[PDB]
Amino acid sequence: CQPIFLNVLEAIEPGVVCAGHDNNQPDSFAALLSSLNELGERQLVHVVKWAKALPGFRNLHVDDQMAVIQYSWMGLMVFAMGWRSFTNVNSRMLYFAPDLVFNEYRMHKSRMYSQCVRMRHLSQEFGWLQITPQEFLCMKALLLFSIIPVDGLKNQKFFDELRMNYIKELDRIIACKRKNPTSCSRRFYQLTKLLDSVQPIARELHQFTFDLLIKSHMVSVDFPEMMAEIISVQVPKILSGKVKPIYFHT
Numbered sequence: 001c002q003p004i005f006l007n008v009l010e011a012i013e014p015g016v017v018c019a020g021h022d023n024n025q026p027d028s029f030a031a032l033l034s035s036l037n038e039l040g041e042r043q044l045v046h047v048v049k050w051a052k053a054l055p056g057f058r059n060l061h062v063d064d065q066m067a068v069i070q071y072s073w074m075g076l077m078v079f080a081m082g083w084r085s086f087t088n089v090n091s092r093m094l095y096f097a098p099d100l101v102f103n104e105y106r107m108h109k110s111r112m113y114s115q116c117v118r119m120r121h122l123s124q125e126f127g128w129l130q131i132t133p134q135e136f137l138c139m140k141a142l143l144l145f146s147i148i149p150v151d152g153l154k155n156q157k158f159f160d161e162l163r164m165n166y167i168k169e170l171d172r173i174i175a176c177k178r179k180n181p182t183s184c185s186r187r188f189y190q191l192t193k194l195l196d197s198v199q200p201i202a203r204e205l206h207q208f209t210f211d212l213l214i215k216s217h218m219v220s221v222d223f224p225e226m227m228a229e230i231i232s233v234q235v236p237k238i239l240s241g242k243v244k245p246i247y248f249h250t
C-alpha cells in the first residue's frame with residue numbers, strides 16, 4: 001500500500017532556517033531574545049507554507065486554516081526544535097538554528113532557564129523512545145490539529161475529520177513493521193504522552209513571550225510585525241482560556 005502520505009510529509013518538510021544572530025556579540029537578554037523573535041518570524045513563513053501543503057489541510061474552512069496554524073505555532077516550534085537538537089547535537093543543547101544554539105549560559109541569560117530545561121527533556125525523549133523520522137513527521141502534523149477554540153472552529157466537523165485522519169496515519173505508521181495490537185497500543189500510549197507534553201511547555205512560552213511583548217520597550221527586545229500580531233491577537237485567547245489544547249490524556 002501507500003507511502004504516499006509519508007512521501008508528502010517528507011517532501012514538504014521545511015529546510016534549515018537561520019536566525020541571523022551574530023555569535024561574536026555578547027550573550028545578553030536583549031540580543032538573544034531579539035534573535036529568537038526574528039527566527040520566529042522567518043519560521044512562521046515556512047510553517048504557513050508547510051501547513052497549507054499538508055494532505056487535506058485545504059478542505060478546512062479558509063478562516064480556520066490560519067487560526068489553527070497560529071494557535072499551534074509555538075508547539076510546532078517546540079517539537080521541531082527538540083527534534084533538531086536530537087539529530088544535530090544529541091539533545092545536549094537547544095538547537096533553535098545553526099547560528100542560534102543555546103548552551104547552559106545562554107539558557108540563563110534568556111531568563112527562561114527552567115523552560116529550556118523542560119525543552120531539553122522533551123528533546124531527550126526522541127532518543128529515549130527511539131522516535132523515528134516517520135513517527136516524528138506524523139506527530140508534528142498532528143500537533144497542528146491539537147489546539148482549538150473551546151466553542152469551536154467555523155467548520156469544526158471538517159477539522160474533526162482531518163484530525164481523525166492524521167491519527168489513523170499515526171496508527172498505521174505504528175502498525176507498520178509491528179505485529180500484535182498490544183505492541184501497537186503501547187507505542188501509541190508513548191507517542192500520545194509525548195504529544196501532550198508539548199502543550200504545557202508551549203503554554204509557558206506563550207505566557208513568557210506575551211509578557212515580554214508588553215514589556216519590550218523597557219527591556220530593549222524588539223518584535224517583528226507578524227510575531228507582534230499573533231502574540232497580541234491569537235496568544236491572549238489561549239492565555240485567557242478561549243483556545244485550549246486537545247490533550248489525549250487527563
Ligand SMILES: O=c1cc(C(F)(F)F)c2cc(N(CC(F)(F)F)CC(F)(F)F)ccc2[nH]1
Nearest residue numbers: 036037039040077078081096205208209227
Ligand atoms: O525553533 C524554534 C523553537 C522555539 C521554542 F522555544 F518555542 F521551542 C522558538 C521560540 C520563539 N519565541 C519564544 C520565546 F519566547 F521563547 F523566546 C519568540 C517568539 F517571539 F517568537 F514568540 C521564536 C523562535 C523559535 N524557534
